[PDB]
């Protein structure tokens, strides 16, 4: 029975809704850029492309690690699943820490949320994505803990798969945000 | 006879208002026709009651009449296309903005009152080259020399000439307001930063046929006393208008400048009712 997977359908449609949420955020950002004429990144702001690219590379690497974990999960092997998902969790935590460090260095040199119109849209566009990353990390921890406490079944496999493409959605959203904020300007 | 088919629309004091009223009456007649036909169909089909003589024979169970679907989907396209054509025509004929008006009023809306400016007068007869102030704009609001300011005890009155091209430039100090004079059959929102919000805060009327007093309301949501932002428009002849402008250039209030040309100095259409608190109030 169960020719298509039901948790998969649910996760896909919910990911679509979250795409609409990020649509709202992108609209907020794209407006008020057309109002800043000239040096539209204002008085004190300078983005650090020497630190923005490594964290993106780590995020893509984590996506690849998660896909490898999915491959390990499709065959009834739980230990490879665990290894690859621990690696993915660590890479994601490193991304989050790098983003926080960039936040600190950017806030102690000017740009703040109540300081300018650019700081507000920048911080809201990136912080909600960071929150989604933290949610994905929590999901990873819960999935691993659940694998520890019962026999490995196709339901466990399905859980791994749906968590994986949630992570992939987060990664593609970050790619869009990065391309929009650091290159297009 | 057409006073009933206008559903309460006041007869306009402006040619664009007259055109709008014609379009409105035509559309209302069309909608009444369609609604009457549909009501007739429903009330007719409500005579197909179950007859007691009807045996154990259900109705014809037909369903799925295919060409009727195409017919009833092709006619409403016709009606809506005709209405859209005429709507586009009238809405282009309602926002014209010729470059050479005769009077330019600067309307400013703030928290629960109005302020009018008299920016420029330039009559086509050849006369009345008036001007504005701009020594103090130090950033989007407009300041002039002859300004009519309303208060909670006196309602602002905007004196305008009859039969002249008038232009309005709308600006708000804090929040969104609305500029509705019902006799114009037209209204527009008053925005804080109209340029940074890509809005056209400028609109013109060709002439005002009648004379006298007309009311004006706010049509936004502004806060507590949103229902207490009324104003009045007084339309006089260009001679009374030159008399008023001169009596105002000589330092005089709006009420005195109005009493100088034999006009009631206070608003006769609406009255400056107190900022009320209730009926049982301890006054």
């Amino acid at each position: 029975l169960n020719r298509p997977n039901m948790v998969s359908v649910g996760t896909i449609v919910w990911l679509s809704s979250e795409l609409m949420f990020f649509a709202g955020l992108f609209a907020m950002y794209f407006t008020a850029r057309a109002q800043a004429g000239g040096a539209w990144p204002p008085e004190p702001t300078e983005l650090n492309l020497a630190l923005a690219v490594p964290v993106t590379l780590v995020l893509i690497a984590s996506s690849f690690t998660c896909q490898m974990g999915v491959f390990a999960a499709e065959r009834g092997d739980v230990f490879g699943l665990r290894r690859w998902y621990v690696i993915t969790f660590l890479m994601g935590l490193f991304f989050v820490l790098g983003q926080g460090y960039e936040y600190i260095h950017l806030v102690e040199h000017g740009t703040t949320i109540p300081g300018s119109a650019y700081g507000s849209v920048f911080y809201l566009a990136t912080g909600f994505h960071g929150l989604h990353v933290i949610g994905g990390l929590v999901a990873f921890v819960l999935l691993l803990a659940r694998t520890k406490m019962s026999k490995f079944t196709p339901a466990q496999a399905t859980a791994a798969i749906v968590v994986s493409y949630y992570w992939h959605f987060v990664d593609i959203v970050w790619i869009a945000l990065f391309a929009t904020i650091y290159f297009v300007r | 006879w057409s006073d009933a088919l206008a559903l309460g629309w006041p007869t306009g004091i402006t040619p664009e208002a007259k055109l709008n009223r014609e379009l409105w009456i035509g559309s209302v007649i069309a909608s009444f026709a369609v609604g009457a036909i549909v009501w007739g169909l429903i009330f007719w089909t409500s005579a197909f009651h179950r007859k007691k003589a009807t045996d154990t024979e259900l109705p014809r169970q037909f369903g799925y009449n295919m060409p009727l679907e195409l017919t009833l989907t092709v006619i409403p396209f016709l009606i809506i296309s005709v209405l859209f054509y005429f709507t586009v025509v009238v809405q282009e004929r309602m926002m014209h903005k010729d470059p050479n008006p005769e009077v330019v009023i600067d309307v400013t809306a703030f928290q629960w009152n109005w302020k009018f400016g008299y920016q420029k007068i330039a009559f086509a007869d050849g006369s009345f080259d008036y001007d504005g102030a701009d020594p103090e704009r130090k950033t989007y609001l407009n300041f002039d020399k002859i300004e009519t300011l309303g208060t909670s005890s006196e309602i602002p009155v905007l004196v305008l000439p009859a039969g002249k091209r008038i232009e309005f430039v709308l600006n708000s100090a804090d929040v969104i307001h609305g500029f509705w004079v019902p006799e114009f059959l037209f209204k527009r929102d008053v925005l804080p930063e109209p340029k940074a919000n890509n809005s056209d805060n400028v609109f013109q009327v060709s002439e005002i046929q009648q004379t006298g007093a007309f009311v004006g309301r706010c049509t936004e949501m502004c806060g507590t006393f949103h229902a207490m932002m009324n104003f009045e428009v007084r339309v006089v002849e260009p001679n009374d208008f030159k008399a008023y402008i001169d009596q105002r250039n000589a330092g005089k209030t709006n009420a005195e400048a109005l009493a100088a040309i034999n006009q009631p100095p206070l608003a006769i259409t609406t009255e400056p009712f107190e900022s009320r608190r209730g009926e049982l109030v301890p006054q």
Partner: protein, 139 residues
């Protein structure tokens, strides 16, 4: 699953057409140029429909006909054993109470209440996720 994919594909086509038309017609003939809000909204609505329709198409392209996708199917064809459907549970109301606590702490700016609500949300979601997987107690 042909009709689901076809529905979402029709929606995607219409949304993409509307998006591109609105984008170019605001690039021209507009008081300030591109509108930049409705354009983004329509583009990402098209993206939503595209994601869902593409997933459904990929699922349908590698699946045998189901008893509910085939007329002349019999009710004895679906005979078998369906999935697992949860009986009674009290974790949803606790999740809702935790989320409401965090929401009240965000409405009235109280960071201690926000943190307590977040911790309660984590705890109750853990309880919901582990409910049918805890083993017997090890004594």
């Amino acid at each position: 699953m042909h009709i689901e994919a076809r529905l979402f594909e029709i929606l995607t086509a219409f949304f993409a057409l509307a998006a591109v038309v609105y984008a170019v017609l605001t690039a021209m003939f507009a008081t300030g140029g591109v509108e930049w809000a409705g354009t983004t909204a329509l583009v990402l609505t098209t993206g939503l429909t595209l994601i869902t329709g593409t997933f459904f198409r990929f699922v349908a392209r590698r699946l045998d006909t189901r008893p509910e996708d085939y007329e002349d199917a019999e009710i004895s064809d679906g005979a078998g054993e369906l999935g697992f459907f949860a009986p009674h549970s009290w974790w949803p109301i606790l999740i809702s109470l935790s989320f409401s606590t965090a929401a009240v702490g965000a409405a009235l700016w109280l960071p201690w209440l926000i943190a307590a609500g977040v911790a309660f949300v984590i705890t109750s979601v853990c309880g919901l996720v582990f409910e049918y997987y805890w083993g017997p107690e090890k004594h």
